[PDB]
Paper text:
On these grounds, we identified the same enzyme, EUGO from Rhodococcus jostii RHA1, as a promising candidate biocatalyst for the efficient and selective dehydrogenation of dihydrosinapyl alcohol into sinapyl alcohol. This VAO-type enzyme is easy to produce using Escherichia coli, and its crystal structure has been determined. To achieve this, a variant of eugenol oxidase was engineered for the oxidation of dihydrosinapyl alcohol into sinapyl alcohol with good conversion and chemoselectivity. To understand the effects of the introduced mutations in the EUGO8X and EUGO10X, their crystal structures were solved at 2.3 and 1.6 Å resolution, respectively.
In that campaign, mutations D151E and Q425S were found to be critical for controlling the selectivity and rate of dehydrogenation, respectively. We therefore incorporated these two mutations into EUGO8X, generating a new biocatalyst referred to as EUGO10X. When purified and assayed, the EUGO10X biocatalyst generated sinapyl alcohol from dihydrosinapyl alcohol with only a trace amount of side products and with complete conversion over 24 h. The 10-fold mutant was found to have a melting temperature of 76 °C, only slightly below that of the thermostable EUGO5X template (80 °C). The D151E and Q425S mutations were introduced in the heart of the active site of EUGO8X, resulting in the EUGO10X mutant featuring enhanced chemoselectivity for dehydrogenation. By superposing the substrate-bound structures of EUGO8X and EUGO10X, a subtle ∼20° rotation of the plane of the aromatic ring and concomitant shift in the position of the propanol side chain of dihydrosinapyl alcohol can be observed. This is permitted by the smaller side chain of Q425S. Improved substrate binding is also allowed by the mutations, via a hydrogen-bonding network of the substrate and the side chains of D151E and R278. Inspection of the crystal structure further reveals that E151 may be better positioned than D151 to promote the deprotonation of the reactive quinone methide intermediate, leading to the formation of the dehydrogenated product. Furthermore, E151 may selectively decrease the accessibility of the side chain of the para-quinone methide intermediate to water, due to the bulkiness of its side chain, causing the drastic reduction of the rate of formation of hydroxylated side-products.
Residue numbers in the entry:
A (entry chain B), B (entry chain A): 2 to 526
């Protein structure tokens, strides 16, 4: 059957598709099953079909976005705006609401509008990937560096708009986002901050402007379609050194985190975003599961010791990067060695001390942590046939016992559902993103359903323990927002009220972050 | 005559006042003219009466705030929430809309709810002043320090809610704000961030929570009455050093700013928030105008030279503070001396090198920049009889030509309207707050009217040159929001839609930031 927007007939949708073609050109509207396969979730969750797009519209300009939104309002067509649509682990480009039209802004709105060397910023359209911006900075001999997530094929804008993160001192992308332009849900266009002052040169200099500060309301949001976004860019330091600390025992996690916090909270000596990855995460980056265990069910401890011995890695592997003059780097590395060396069996390696396969992750972090984008971690998806992943990322206090509690709770459910537990604590100043990647055979419908049921269990169990997730997959958005229900669901009620005011026809990404416009509430999707 | 809410009769207002007394206690409702005199703007702007409160209500609890908001909805009573109501320069405690009832949350909601040494944060009620928090930290021998504005008698919460700023590395108060509790305009209570997840310990560790990020919409805002707010607290460094650089000429401003930017953008060597204050600003802190000049009109060049000579200060005076191990401080100070020394006439002083009257401001900055609150700057108001100030604060790029353009533009109008121009550039990473404090005799109605007309001209003239203000006085809020009118007033229309959705009866601080609810729009008050 043809995927159609809810309540929209074949005739009405054909008519809307043609109005879209009038705006963007016939080449830039996709609506056949073969064309749309590329836009389904690449890592499907659940046995049954879900998150089916009805079309893809690729606008060239803000003016075209406004016209697309107005047409969607006339026809009642839901729109899922994306930048590059590489939100893999959280749905890809696929809409939360099946039948929605994807607005792929980044296909043609892909210009670097400004890179300012003096004030250190960029003004970007959504199609600028991290690779694109890196190539620009390299080609202009820029003194600036970008901040990228693990995979460079995503969007500087799009990643920020889901509050994604990277690993340099500028790792909080939303923090350094400065100014945006957005098409509101009925087609009006708005600039935030100093961009609201005509002729201001400070759109990318001063984020707040005047009055209530709105930009965060357009992140993890369905309140508009972003068409331009500014971001601050850090100056590249004169030198850097990355390092790996291997820790032998599962149980070391508690002491690692507790030693880490005093070294991190003042952004020195731990200047970048430390990451603490387990052996499964690192092994998946350089090898397939069957090299260590080709049997049924969870991997046995003998197979784990082999992974560690052969890759020369610990169960927990701490990656960091230091920046600045060589003397500062040496002083900070000495402090780090002296602190973590109090853990029995810890071993230290700089990026120049490992040329072996187990050191491939360290080399990859040394790129990433220096704003050099990479795709090396895509090899994690070769762990099993037809590999995909889902991201389960609860927030943790930077406390070793809390980390251990979360590790044990996730590992337990992981084992129960026969999914390997790849873990990476991504460490901020006062919080940790406990990244749980579950890699699975996306062609196997029982594996897909196990992933869905396992993660719904984990969302509930984590919440009963006081833990919430910072970001989540289409399939989990209602469940995750349901956990943030202090005061009889006060937060969601507030969001719904704003959603219905700005989007009275219920057009933009219905269900994003569990926020449904009035016409869709009380339904089973 | 008695001050009444718009459209509310004496009999209705009396009934509402008694309902307020039911909630908070009859002792905690003020409504006579003598009682309300203290809640008038202490630095009145304009000759005519403006911004008159009809009553003051002091709630003891969030539950009482909810009840007050419910009563106000029933009766159509506008409410102006304040914490400590010390917003001097911007209206004091006085409401934008005359006839509003001030809700002074800080009078009785004044508890430090938590200070966490390990993770470095505080959870505060609105009545905690900077002095209160400092005394707590001292009393408990805390390793943490606060970040305060120039005057310590304001509210850690209230200052943040107007996006006020201080001068340590944590000087962006809203940035370090983490979690809040707010009573929405119809009386519902909501927690943001991880506080929306019942049982989370991360309310003050991770600001975003899940879904659209709303906390900024409650700053410079009329979308609620905030009852609790968290804020991160920096660890106190092992050592510090403050310094003053004096520069001889008005025209040095261009070179000072251009030398400063490379030293600031990486947060080192200029680690704190530098301030660049002109001789009028520093002279007012230690002396009266008639010490230097008792004639008519703007101060002549020779009197300006006498201020410089006796106080041993420049026309421009640069104040900074360095932090960290003693060798790091000495290396950074050497970098700062080498850079700024290229300006002919520059002279350098650390806080150890001046014990004269001219050095009083340096010693005060050494307290403020180390989280030690002060009221010394209140002496600026003794510059002339019955002294008050208004804050005209355009944002400037950190560019010397732009700073000079703004200086010359403001000086030109200050001279025209016979107001001394006290200037302080408060310097962020990529932007400066160009603080123009105009000090005037508040008893002189012509001076008050000159201040109003001069600043209205400056708002328009600055906007014509592409500059907007970050914060403003009641009397200028409509004019300032009117300058942020890109896209035919798109930003204000967006704020108005949200305002009417959350506040359908138009109760909370109508006209704050130029944002009026439907029932008042177009009424010219
Ligand atoms: C192995 C692996 C490792 C990963 N590591 C990381 C990591 O380190 N850090 C990280 O952050 N992520 C990580 N991810 C997740 C994902 O790869 C990235 O976050 C990716 O950059 C997001 O996709 P994107 O940039 O194309 O954004 P998009 O998919 O274009 O956008 C993401 C979402 O933002 C919203 N949005 C986007 N554009 C607009 C717009 N114009 N208007 C309105 N709303 C919009 C929509 O809700 C959209 O679904 C990882 C994934 C995998 C599989
Ligand atoms: C000489 C001088 C120097 C100054 N220097 C500085 C400086 O360095 N930095 C600086 O930031 N300011 C400065 N100011 C301005 C002012 O002194 C401070 O900002 C002061 O801290 C603000 O008053 P307050 O803290 O009592 O906040 P309040 O007056 O309580 O609140 C300010 C506003 O925030 C909102 N608000 C407050 N509480 C609530 C609540 N509970 N719910 C909802 N909304 C609320 C209201 O709009 C209120 O009007 C200066 C003023 C002068 C005269
Ligand atoms: C920090 O946020 C994320 C980190 C990773 C991988 C971290 C590997 O060390 C994946 C994500 O989504 C799939 C995230 O959101
Ligand atoms: C940085 O923000 C402000 C600074 C000052 C005075 C700075 C003196 O050096 C006053 C203000 O309001 C009256 C401000 O908002």
């Amino acid at each position: 059957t043809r995927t159609l927007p809810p309540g929209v007939s074949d005739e009405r949708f054909d008519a809307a598709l043609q109005r879209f073609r009038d705006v963007v050109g016939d080449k830039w509207v996709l609506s056949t099953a073969d064309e749309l396969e590329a836009f389904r979730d690449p890592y499907p969750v659940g046995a049954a079909e879900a998150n089916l797009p009805s079309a893809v519209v690729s606008p060239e300009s803000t003016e075209q976005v406004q016209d697309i939104v107005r047409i969607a309002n006339e026809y009642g067509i839901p729109l899922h705006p994306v930048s590059t649509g590489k939100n893999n682990g959280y749905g890809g480009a696929a809409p939360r609401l099946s039948g929605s039209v994807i607005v792929k802004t980044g296909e043609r709105m892909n210009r670097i509008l400004e890179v300012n060397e003096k004030y250190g910023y960029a003004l970007l359209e959504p199609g600028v990937t991290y690779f694109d911006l890196y190539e620009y900075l390299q080609s202009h001999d820029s003194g600036l560096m970008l901040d990228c997530p693990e995979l460079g094929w995503g969007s500087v804008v799009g990643n920020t708009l889901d509050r994604g993160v990277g690993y340099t001192p500028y790792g909080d992308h939303f923090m350094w986002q400065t100014g945006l332009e957005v098409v509101l849900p009925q087609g009006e266009v708005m600039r935030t901050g100093m961009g609201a002052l005509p002729g201001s040169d400070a759109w990318q200099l001063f984020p707040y402007g005047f009055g209530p500060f709105p930009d965060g309301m357009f992140t993890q949001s369905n309140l508009g379609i972003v068409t331009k976004m500014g971001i601050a860019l850090m100056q590249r330091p004169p030198a850097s050194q990355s390092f790996l600390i291997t820790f032998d025992k599962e149980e070391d996690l508690e002491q690692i985190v507790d030693i880490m916090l005093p070294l991190r909270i003042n952004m020195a000596p731990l200047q970048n975003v430390p990451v603490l990855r387990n052996i499964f995460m690192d092994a998946a980056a350089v090898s397939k599961r069957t090299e260590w265990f080709d049997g049924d069910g969870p991997m046995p401890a003998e197979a784990i010791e082999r992974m560690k011995k052969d890759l020369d890695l610990g169960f927990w592997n701490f990656y960091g990067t230091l920046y600045g003059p060589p003397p500062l780097i040496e002083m900070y590395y000495g402090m780090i060695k002296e602190a973590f060396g109090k853990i029995p069996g810890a071993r230290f390696f700089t990026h120049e001390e490992r040329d072996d396969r187990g050191g491939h992750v360290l080399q990859d972090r040394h790129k990433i942590n220096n704003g050099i984008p990479s795709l090396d971690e895509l090899q994690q998806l070769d762990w099993v046939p037809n590999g995909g992943h889902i991201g389960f990322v609860p927030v943790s206090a930077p406390d070793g016992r809390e980390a251990m509690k979360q590790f044990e709770m996730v590992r337990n459910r992981a084992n129960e559902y026969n999914k390997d537990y790849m873990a990476s604590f991504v460490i901020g100043l006062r919080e940790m993103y406990h990244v749980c990647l579950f890699i699975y055979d996306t062609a196997d419908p029982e594996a897909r359903e196990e992933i869905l049921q396992m993660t719904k269990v984990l969302v509930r169990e984590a919440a009963e323990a006081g833990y919430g997730e910072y970001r989540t997959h289409n399939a989990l958005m209602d469940d995750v927002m349901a956990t943030f229900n202090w005061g009889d669901g006060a937060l969601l009620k507030f969001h719904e009220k704003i959603k219905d005011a700005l989007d009275p026809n219920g057009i933009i990404a219905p269900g994003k972050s569990g926020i449904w416009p009035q016409r869709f509430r009380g339904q089973n999707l």
